[PDB]
Enzyme design. Structure first.
Site, short mmCIF file in Angstrom:
data_model
loop_
_atom_site.label_atom_id
_atom_site.label_comp_id
_atom_site.label_asym_id
_atom_site.label_seq_id
_atom_site.Cartn_x
_atom_site.Cartn_y
_atom_site.Cartn_z
CG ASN A 38 -29.35 45.02 26.96
OD1 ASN A 38 -30.46 44.64 26.56
ND2 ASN A 38 -28.51 45.78 26.27
CG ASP A 103 -25.97 43.28 31.59
OD1 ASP A 103 -24.96 43.35 30.85
OD2 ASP A 103 -27.05 43.82 31.24
CD1 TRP A 104 -27.40 47.13 31.09
CD2 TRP A 104 -27.51 48.76 32.62
NE1 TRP A 104 -26.65 48.20 30.62
CE2 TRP A 104 -26.71 49.20 31.54
CE3 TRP A 104 -27.71 49.63 33.68
CZ2 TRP A 104 -26.13 50.46 31.52
CZ3 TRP A 104 -27.14 50.89 33.68
CH2 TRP A 104 -26.35 51.29 32.59
CD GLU A 127 -18.51 39.33 33.14
OE1 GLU A 127 -18.98 40.10 32.28
OE2 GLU A 127 -17.31 39.22 33.48
CG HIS A 280 -21.72 39.89 29.91
ND1 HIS A 280 -21.13 40.46 31.02
CD2 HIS A 280 -22.92 40.49 29.75
CE1 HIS A 280 -21.95 41.38 31.51
NE2 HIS A 280 -23.06 41.42 30.76
#
Ligand SMILES: [Cl-]
Length: 308
Positions: A38, A103-104, A127, A280
């Site tokens: 995302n 992330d996702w 991350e 991030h």
């Protein structure tokens, strides 16, 4: 840092819908599957893939309702994403792969691996998403100077998960794209880069996946299905002998330097890589070191395996 996106446009039918993906690299190479999160797309990997493509096949899909993929009428729950990416993988006839995830994209990748452990030859991560039992664990740090930033992060994501307020931010104001993404790169993103990231979400109603994602984060027991799933894959990962490569930055976001140091011990067969300053979206701060270290690490993964 490169702003272009020179890859051939590929599309494949998945559950009736089209998904866009990068596919470069020699067709006969072990495939390396790059999974964004995302609110990014395959664009996130544009400067990392050229380090890997001389030697390996590089496949980088745009998740459903993101990048250049189709935009079905879904609520874009994580399980929706699970369904489409599972079918994507089978649609390209992939057998054994290497995962490169964020992330996702890491939740998706780790969940796929845990369910398909004999098909994963290695995992490069950064991350990535972990259980978040309490809000204090979210962006947790013990570095004094970073505490104010960490509490701001909490506030931000608490708002995203706040009824009506969250939608206002992400859907009407496009906060994930206009604030969170550039906010999570140390260096300044250019207009050209921002425009590449904005392109799929020019219409507010198309921003739904960008809002559901933070509301799916496994924080303080909710949502329970995701908390369970993420606990499961992390247990899997802690016990798996699969080769791992973990990139981290300072001060980082989900993964602070102190935890990166611990994961170097708590994750078997893990090499760690300090990319220097990072938040991030580390890929936008040191893509060259991430691509070169992935490339240096890929050959040994063929060990104990064979194609014939
Ligand atoms: Cl999120």
């Amino acid at each position: 840092i490169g702003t272009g996106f020179p890859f051939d446009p590929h599309y494949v039918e998945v559950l009736g819908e089209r998904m866009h993906y990068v596919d470069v690299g020699p067709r006969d190479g072990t495939p390396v599957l790059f999974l964004h999160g995302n609110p990014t797309s395959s664009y996130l990997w544009r400067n990392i893939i050229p380090h890997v493509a001389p030697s390996h096949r590089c496949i980088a899909p745009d998740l459903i309702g993101m990048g250049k993929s189709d935009k079905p009428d879904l609520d874009y729950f994580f399980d929706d994403h699970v369904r489409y990416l599972d079918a994507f993988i089978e649609a390209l006839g992939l057998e054994e792969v290497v995962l490169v995830i964020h992330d996702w994209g890491s939740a998706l990748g780790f969940h796929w691996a845990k369910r398909n452990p004999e098909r994963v030859k290695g995992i490069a991560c950064m991350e990535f998403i972990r259980p978040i039992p309490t809000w204090d664990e979210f962006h947790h740090t013990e570095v004094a100077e970073e505490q104010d930033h960490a509490e701001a992060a909490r506030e931000t994501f608490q708002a995203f998960r706040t009824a009506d307020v969250g939608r206002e931010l992400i859907i009407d104001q496009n906060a994930f794209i206009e604030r969170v993404l550039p906010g999570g790169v140390v260096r300044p993103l250019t207009e050209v880069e921002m425009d590449h990231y904005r392109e799929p979400f020019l219409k507010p109603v198309d921003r739904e996946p960008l809002w559901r994602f933070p509301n799916e984060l496994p924080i303080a027991g909710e949502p329970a299905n995701i908390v369970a799933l993420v606990e499961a894959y992390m247990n899997w990962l802690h016990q798996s002998p699969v080769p791992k490569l973990l990139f981290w930055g300072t001060p980082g976001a989900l993964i602070p330097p102190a935890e990166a140091a611990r994961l170097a011990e708590s994750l078997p067969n893990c090499k760690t890589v300090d990319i220097g300053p990072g938040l991030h979206y580390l890929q936008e701060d040191n893509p060259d070191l991430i691509g070169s270290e992935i490339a240096r690490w890929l050959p040994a993964l063929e060990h104990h395996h064979h194609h014939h």
